Amino acid sequence: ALADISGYLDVLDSVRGFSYLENAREVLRSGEARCLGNPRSEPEYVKALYVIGASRIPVGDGCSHTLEELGVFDISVPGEMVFPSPLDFFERGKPTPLVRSRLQLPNGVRVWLKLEWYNPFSLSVKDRPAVEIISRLSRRVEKGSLVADATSSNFGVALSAVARLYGYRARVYLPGAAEEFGKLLPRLLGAQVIVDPEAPSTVHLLPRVMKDSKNEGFVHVNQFYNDANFEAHMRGTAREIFVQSRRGGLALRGVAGSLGTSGHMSAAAFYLQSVDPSIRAVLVQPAQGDSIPGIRRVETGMLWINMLDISYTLAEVTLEEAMEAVVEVARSDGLVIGPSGGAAVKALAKKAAEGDLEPGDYVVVVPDTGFKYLSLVQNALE
């Protein structure tokens, strides 16, 4: 029998650790899920279904059910694109677009760009973990409460909008080097902002956020450590590459992206590799000494990419190379992408040039829009 999974989402407030993911992986590998005699007694299996994007669960004494039958492939978007509220727009106005580029790459590697600025609050991929993280709070943390985090810019913006839509107040901490939209937009949205001109990185801010947390008693939602970040990208970003690849007819051989928290690329790699372990994941390593906004080298400490059973290959990319790909995408497709999206395109071009990638379709996740990075654009032009 099928039941609406939304009735069972208290397991999100109670399952802990990664062991449920082993269910997630098996259901995706098999394309089906077994009936649950008593669903409430399998909290780990229920969370596994949620995280892969099921809207219905198979319940009682019955037969197995396919991904399709569980709602993994259901269309959520109203065709006419009319939405009764901003959060409903964020939730049903999905997938974000996936568009074939005209940019030519070596060795039969065909590029598709997944455009994450098509998210309504931050114009970035950060809307998704922010919505997921706030909605989990919303049943344990009293309204009017302050929530806070460290950010490079995007998450701070997404968190201020979302916090306010749910009745919370927000505070964001940013390092001196963050973009102006990051310092300014959260104030427009009603948040407090704290800029530390000392902090040479976002993660360098974290000990101060934690200390202020103990002193002032605000909720530190910690995007670097909060599992709802990874889960957001599982049922959203990663699921959508899967669905879009299968319904669009792509011969999907890999995805390429960048790493901040590692939330979205770990989800993408983990989900897609559950379905077909040979799908590659090509990830940006910003070259030593270069700053590509929003992103970091692997070895500076990242939760999901390290702890989860994920294959990937790294490619070195300088800020100059990232911006040169911004320029070439612009001239080739008329699409203006952010430096981190340029970096990913480039990392994929490099792996394509070395001959380690099968010919096929590859999805590059473009975290945000290049409109936000004018002085980087000015410099790339010279």
The structure's method of determination equals X-ray
Q: How far, in Å, CA of 206 to CA of 191, rounded? A: 18
Judge residue 270's burial from the number of C-beta atoms within 10 Å of its C-beta, 0-12 exposed, 13-18 middle, 19 or more buried: buried
Q: Is 313 annotated as a binding residue?
A: no
At 108, list the tokens. Answer: 């039969």
Q: Is 154 annotated as a binding residue?
A: yes
Reduce the secondary structure of the chain to three states and give it as a string: CEEEHHHHHHHHHCCCCCCCHHHHHHHHHHCEECCECCHHHCHHHHHHHHHHCCCEEEECCCCCEECCCCCCCCCCCCCCCCCCCHHHHHHHCCCCCEEECCCCCHHHEEEEEEEHHHCCCCCECCHHHHHHHHHHHCCCCCCCCEEEEECCCHHHHHHHHHHHHCCCEEEEEEECCCCHHHHHHHHHCCCEEEEECCCCCCHHHHHHHHHHHHHHCCEECCCCCCHHHHHHHHHHHHHHHHHHHHHCCCCEEEEEECCCCCHHHHHHHHHHHHHCCCCEEEEEEECCCCCCCCCCCHHHCCHHHHHCCCCCEEEEECHHHHHHHHHHHHHHHCCCECHHHHHHHHHHHHHHHHCCCCCEEEEEEECEEHHHCHHHHHHHHC
Q: Is 23 annotated as a binding residue?
A: no
Q: Determine the residue type at 263.
A: G
Q: Is 55 annotated as a binding residue?
A: no
Phi first, then psi: what are they for 98, rounded to 5°?
A: -125, 120
Q: Which domains does the chain have, with CATH numbers?
A: 1-77 (3.90.1530.20), 78-126+227-382 (3.40.50.1100), 127-226 (3.40.50.1100)
Angle ∠(203,206,211) on CA atoms, nearest 5: 165
Q: Is 65 annotated as a binding residue?
A: no
Q: Determine the residue type at 194.
A: I
Q: Is 64 annotated as a binding residue?
A: no
Residue 180's contacts (CB-CB under 8 Å, 6 or more residues apart) are none
Nearest Cα to 264, choosing from 173, 366, 336? Answer: 366
At 5, list the tokens. Answer: 């999974």
Instruction: State the Rg of the chain over Cα.
Output: 20
Q: Is 261 annotated as a binding residue?
A: yes
Q: How far, in Å, CA of 108 to CA of 352, rounded? A: 8
